[PDB]
Write a protein that binds this ligand. Structure first.
Ligand SMILES: [Ca+2]
Ligand SMILES: [Ca+2]
Ligand SMILES: [Ca+2]
Ligand SMILES: [Ca+2]
Ligand SMILES: [Ca+2]
Ligand SMILES: [Ca+2]
Ligand SMILES: [Ca+2]
Ligand SMILES: [Ca+2]
Ligand SMILES: [Ca+2]
Ligand SMILES: [Ca+2]
Ligand SMILES: [Ca+2]
Ligand SMILES: [Ca+2]
Ligand SMILES: [Ca+2]
Ligand SMILES: [Ca+2]
Ligand SMILES: [Ca+2]
Ligand SMILES: [Ca+2]
Ligand SMILES: [Ca+2]
Lengths: 613, 616
């Protein structure tokens, strides 16, 4: 998964992640709530003035920067309710025996001159019998309490500037100078509750992402080494620690994120700074109204260009990245997977195609994941290999080519092929998958998409035609575009045999024996350990999901293997990364799943006969 | 005067400038009205969020950036009405026979791709019979009509960036590209009406300042040389044309003003770029809440720090610089005079002293002018020479020493000396001038200050200090039963007088008329006043005060232990010493200040020393 961490598996990494996000969101106390709401209703162009009104005064359903407006919700109490729902309760200065500053909310404040506008939250996770099981440490980014916002922010900005322009280790020592004492009292508190360093999660966003990396840098030497094996997940940090301890998560179009290298100011710092970084997720795009805008991007991408900071705001971090966590494609992803997160306003969502523009960023490689919203989206895949997820709402998909998985989600979803129905082949396995094969051999596996739009010039001489996806073909009323010749199996073990003319063969679940003929067949073994025999001709073998340990017989020169939505594909992996000889057979391994090409020598294979997506 | 332009002289360059400002303000259509009104109420600190709310939404007495809010006044009708009160009526596309684009307000829009967000107003002044007498051309700075604010602003800023980072001469050609055809129609429309270039005023703020400079650069060679003798007054321009045609007016703490040199982006462009520039007013400060604030100024001054942009906003340009135009000190000032303008919010004004902090600027030289508001101000003159102006409102002054003029204005005004009354001498000519002399000989001439505050030794034998308020009366400073006496005086009349000092030493007040002031062996202070006066020392260590239009005077007996003091006199350029004003005429040294002069009978110029001739 993109957020895999240390040697925690997929699931434990995600749980860690969601906690870090939750405690990071709490540390801001819903300050950008008003912005988020104003933006969602108004956008970031014509209606940007109105978005900004809401950023300051919120509305009936949001609180902006100004406190005590009666018709606003109590966003701060919602912020506390939210963190508790996640399992976290602030630990009082009283429980730690801390003699430093806190405010009425229990927020801890930096200890030394020049660090007094620093903020951190210390939080506990308690079990059923009420024992402490985990400590959360969330460092607040730039900004402070609504009561002292401007003055507090000015302090933070001096600190930010010192990170870039001051003592060489300024950023590294930030947490030592700000919370050295608080953290000794935290070490004592954990000990007293039977907790070690492994039971501590450290998070924060922006300046607080800097703090995360600071503590990681200091953790080997300070606090008696107690925090050395703690969990560090930082969001939108300008810096990266010199350790291997920190997961640095951000949107590649957030200009704050990785602004420094790892704390060095460079020429890149005030422009695009998108070089690959070991600690960072390199390729996550917040597809927001700014990113999508042609007008906005006539201006230079720069941390100095304030409008670009929309991509920095923490609510879109929490909302967009949560949907990456929930995604059906999640386990396909890794740290540097290209992922496009639908983050448009309501009015831009109505007329803007979410797509990989690759704006202001190094060239994206490998497959692309586009993650929709729970509202009606317009999603456009590229000409390469795509994973498009609609989620809820009535979504419409386009895609430019290659090898794709398109999941409609809930709602009434539509795939717009933009071309004549006659340039495609359709098949359906009877188990919720519609296969679309285009004139170039690219295959899309589609689910929950009930309408296909095609352009028919020589029926509508100037021309969209809408086909329903049914068990008997694609239908325009009573008129049928037939699926390609198929043999459908069951979720039991089946023997399936192709006709001489070629068939799509659908094992579905169970260990199936698929017997090709002299024709060009398409083999979909399905889940389970399948035996597939070519029988001659130019055959396609397609592998998707947790496909099993398959055996392929009679595979030749003119045959194609297709891997799509399978485990362990690093950006731009080719077949060689997954292939070995075992005996006389070539095996291709994808996570725990495998294909054995019986009697085929590794050296006879060509990347053009082997598609990895 | 600070805004003297070409050879129009004091008064006509003032009226020119007020015209330039009036049309510059119109071009913005009151876009910053809600900010100005928000700032005045809330300030720029704790109140900054509320200030921005008003900037966007206005209120019941202002319109912010957002159109169509029921309870706002029509700030765009107010702007039209204001430009009309100023004499101007926008000229229509039909009158010009212009085939380009205009919007519902008559505003003209740029002509070519990449200039479509440029805006200009073309206006006409008409006489009593309705004949065109003048054309005004007012280019809009960054921003556009409210209906399209953001997208229009993005275009403008792209233009700003190309001014710095684009083709050489991008700024020079901007008006050529944006409005080349419009200008041809304007030439033809002016010729049609009997006008030449000299009847054209060109103005604009920010990017419109850049546009003033572009048009000046191009005027020689384009549109047939027609506007080569036009009038060019640019506000807050980041650039300066390569010509001698443009008055570049700006606040020195405005980060946009002079950002480029004169079109070149340098290291200083992103910081302080306060180098003297021939075409520009180098030393005018907007004393606003940002400038005042120690916390804000922790942050580096840069066009890249958006808060510093408070000093850029047009209403504070119109309002501050109008007070400059109106000042009783106006005609003392020149292009590079140090001038501090009171621009504080209502909450900042009650507790912040207006003073020359010299923040984020080259060291200020010469006398300092501090201009107040029509509210109650706190004004702090420096240890050098100051001209302090309260205007209306109940004002309070402090001043750190030197030679000063302090005009209280209307209201109940107070001079706070911050030390014992015993360290000052006081004199009064009976004509409204109260003179305050400190322990070092520094003189302040004050008018319309009815209260003097002193800090006196108090309880426990001076451990504690008392603040005592004295009333200025005919017989002295008075506190209850205690009178602080004026220094011994002889007062003349507004006709010709002969006045004689007693040997103990007197202040000799000639007043109007040509007076004969006879000093004695004591230390006298001579104030010939208006008219041509004859003043003889008599010996001792004497002081001769010259202020205003002091006439042609003759001083006899001036020696090495005497002192001349020029205060509030014409033609003192920043940091002038006497040598810029001194010549020999036969046996006599002559000092000249505009049309006024002092002749030091039989003193040789080369025996003089700056110690004995104070110029302020
Ligand atoms: Ca803070
Ligand atoms: Ca990237
Ligand atoms: Ca694709
Ligand atoms: Ca959706
Ligand atoms: Ca859907
Ligand atoms: Ca089966
Ligand atoms: Ca199977
Ligand atoms: Ca076959
Ligand atoms: Ca299988
Ligand atoms: Ca504009
Ligand atoms: Ca200056
Ligand atoms: Ca002074
Ligand atoms: Ca006043
Ligand atoms: Ca007289
Ligand atoms: Ca006289
Ligand atoms: Ca004498
Ligand atoms: Ca005289």
């Amino acid at each position: 998964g993109v957020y895999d961490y240390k040697n925690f598996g997929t699931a434990d990494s995600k749980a860690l992640f969601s906690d870090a996000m939750a405690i990071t969101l709490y540390s801001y106390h819903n300050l950008d709530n008003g912005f988020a709401a104003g933006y969602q209703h108004n956008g970031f162009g014509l209606g940007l003035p109105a978005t900004l009104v809401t950023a300051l005064l919120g509305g009936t359903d949001s609180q902006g920067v100004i406190p005590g407006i009666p018709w606003n919700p109590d966003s701060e109490k919602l912020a506390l309710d939210a963190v508790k729902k996640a399992g976290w309760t602030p630990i009082t200065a009283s429980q730690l025996g801390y003699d430093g500053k806190t405010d009425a909310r229990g927020t801890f404040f930096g200890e030394k001159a020049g660090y007094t506008t620093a903020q951190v939250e210390i939080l506990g996770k308690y079990d059923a019998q009420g024992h402490l099981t985990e400590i959360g440490i969330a460092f607040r980014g730039t900004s402070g309490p609504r009561e002292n916002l401007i003055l507090d922010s000015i302090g933070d900005v001096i600190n930010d500037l010192l990170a870039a322009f001051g003592p060489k280790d300024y950023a590294k020592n930030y947490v030592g100078e700000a919370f050295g004492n608080l953290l000794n009292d935290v070490v004592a508190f954990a000990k007293a509750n039977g907790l070690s360093g492994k039971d501590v999660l450290v998070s924060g966003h922006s300046l607080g992402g800097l703090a995360v990396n600071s503590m990681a840098d200091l953790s080997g030497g300070k606090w008696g080494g107690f925090f050395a094996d703690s969990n560090y997940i930082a969001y939108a940090s300008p810096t990266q620690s010199s350790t291997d301890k920190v997961l640095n998560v951000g949107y590649e179009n957030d200009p704050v994120f990785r602004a420094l290298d790892g704390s060095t100011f460079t020429g890149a710092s005030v422009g695009v700074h998108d070089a690959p970084k070991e600690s960072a997720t390199d390729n996550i795009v917040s597809f927001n109204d700014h990113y999508a805008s042609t007008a906005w991007n006539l201006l230079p991408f720069s941390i100095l260009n304030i409008p670009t900071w929309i991509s920095h705001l923490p609510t879109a971090y929490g909302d967009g990245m949560n949907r990456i966590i929930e995604s059906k494609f999640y386990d396909l992803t890794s740290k540097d997977s290209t992922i496009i997160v639908a983050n448009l306003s309501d009015p831009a969502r109505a007329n803007t195609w979410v797509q990989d523009l690759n704006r202001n960023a190094e060239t994206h490689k490998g497959s692309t994941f586009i993650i929709g919203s729970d509202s009606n989206d317009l999603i456009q895949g590229g000409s390469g290999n795509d994973y498009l997820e609609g989620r809820a709402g009535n979504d419409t998909f386009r895609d430019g080519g290659g090898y794709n998985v398109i999941l409609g989600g809930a709602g009434n979803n539509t795939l717009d092929l933009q071309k004549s129905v006659n340039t495609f082949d359709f098949a359906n396995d009877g188990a919720g998958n519609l296969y679309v094969r285009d004139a170039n051999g690219g295959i899309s596996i589609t689910r929950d998409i009930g309408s296909i739009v095609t352009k028919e010039p020589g029926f509508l001489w100037g021309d969209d035609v809408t086909h329903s996806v049914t068990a008997s073909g694609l239908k325009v009323g009573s008129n049928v575009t037939q699926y390609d010749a198929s043999v459908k199996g069951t979720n039991g073990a089946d023997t399936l045999k192709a006709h001489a003319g070629g068939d799509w063969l659908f094992g579905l679940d169970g260990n199936d024996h698929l017997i090709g003929g002299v024709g060009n067949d398409v083999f979909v073994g399905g889940a389970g350990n399948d035996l597939m025999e070519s029988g001659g001709g130019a055959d396609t073998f397609l592998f998707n999901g947790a496909f099993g340990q398959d055996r392929v017989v009679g595979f030749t020169s003119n045959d194609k293997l297709v891997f799509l939505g399978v485990q362990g594909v690093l950006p731009n992996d080719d077949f060689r990364a997954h292939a070995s000889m075992v005996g006389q057979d070539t095996v291709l391994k994808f996570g725990g799943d495998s294909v054995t090409l019986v009697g085929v020598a590794l050296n006879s294979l060509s990347a053009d006969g082997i598609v990895i997506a």
